[PDB]
Ligand binder design. Structure first.
Ligand SMILES: C[S@@+](CC[C@H](N)C(=O)[O-])C[C@H]1O[C@@H](n2cnc3c(N)ncnc32)[C@H](O)[C@@H]1O
Ligand SMILES: O=S(=O)(c1ccc2c(c1)CN[C@@H](CF)C2)N1CCSCC1
Length: 264
């Protein structure tokens, strides 16, 4: 309770535009360099889905924040998608892009790169069209509660698959809390279901405007073990080491991990 209400307090200052700018605009957001983290992440999301292994009807994105890139390759495999976030402002920022409102963040370069990578000959507008169509709702959530979505959420539970990028470690004061939060969201997944977990490796802080957030520094092994401890079978685990040119003043992240896990 103490460690959670403290994080919750820091997030009250979280500025979406500042977050988007620090991470999804160049240099980290430059998709032209094949060696950048942007191309690497999109590639690993596309290859995972191209296997045909991850499919079903409903999907939940845990801690969406103001981003949708994590769902570009996923959207053509799930007709009902639920996006979520703890903050009102992020859910509003998402709405601005989903409803094509004014001031929405421009994700077009990412959509185009996902199309380029997938190689199905799809134009980026159709991709965004399909994502917007399949995202049925944007709900509040708290991975710290035993029932993250709450009592009677509109979300079709359990889900056939889950996606979570940079949420758990960024809202957990320590490894133990990270483990619990993972246990918590795992209850939202159907047995045999899939979890695509993405996050920061050995990171301890990051900025988002006037907000300065703490992060729990986790390692690939710690993540692997935590996944096992939560009833998962790790189908794939990859690490991307942050090169010097992508190490800016916005945080102290050392690498990024990708975990494809199956609830057994
Ligand atoms: C660094 S962001 C990750 C956003 C996005 N998934 C991405 O890939 O960039 C962390 C997100 O977790 C949200 N969050 C904060 N406290 C949370 C909590 N207790 N439960 C769930 N999400 C929370 C924040 O509002 C924020 O959108
Ligand atoms: O690896 S990123 O640079 C990235 C993307 C998001 C974040 C971080 C790093 C590190 N701090 C996280 C907050 F804890 C947020 N990349 C941004 C371009 S698209 C793939 C993800």
């Amino acid at each position: 309770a103490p460690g959670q209400a403290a994080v919750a307090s820091a997030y009250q200052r979280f500025e979406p535009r500042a977050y988007l700018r620090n991470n999804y605009a160049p240099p980290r957001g430059d998709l032209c360099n094949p060696n950048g983290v942007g191309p690497w992440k999109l590639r690993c999301l596309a290859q995972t889905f191209a296997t045909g292994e991850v499919s079903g009807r409903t999907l939940i994105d845990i801690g969406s924040g103001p981003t949708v890139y994590q769902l570009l390759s996923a959207c053509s495999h799930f007709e009902d998608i639920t996006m979520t976030d703890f903050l009102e402002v992020n859910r509003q920022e998402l709405g601005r892009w989903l409803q094509e409102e004014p001031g929405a963040f421009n994700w077009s370069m990412y959509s185009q790169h996902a199309c380029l990578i997938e190689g199905k000959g799809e134009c980026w507008q159709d991709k965004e069209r399909q994502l917007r169509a399949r995202v049925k709702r944007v709900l509040p959530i708290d991975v710290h509660q035993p029932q993250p979505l709450g009592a009677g959420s509109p979300a079709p539970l359990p889900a056939d698959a889950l996606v979570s990028a940079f949420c758990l470690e960024a809202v957990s004061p320590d490894l133990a809390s990270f483990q619990r939060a993972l246990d918590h969201i795992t209850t939202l997944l159907r047995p045999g279901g899939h979890l695509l977990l993405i996050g920061a490796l050995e990171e301890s802080w990051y900025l988002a405007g006037e907000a300065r957030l703490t992060v729990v520094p986790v390692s690939e092994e710690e993540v692997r073990e935590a996944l096992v401890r939560s009833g998962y079978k790790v189908r794939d685990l990859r690490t991307y080491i942050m090169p010097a040119h992508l190490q800016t003043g916005v945080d102290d992240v050392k690498g990024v991990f990708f975990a494809w896990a199956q609830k057994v």
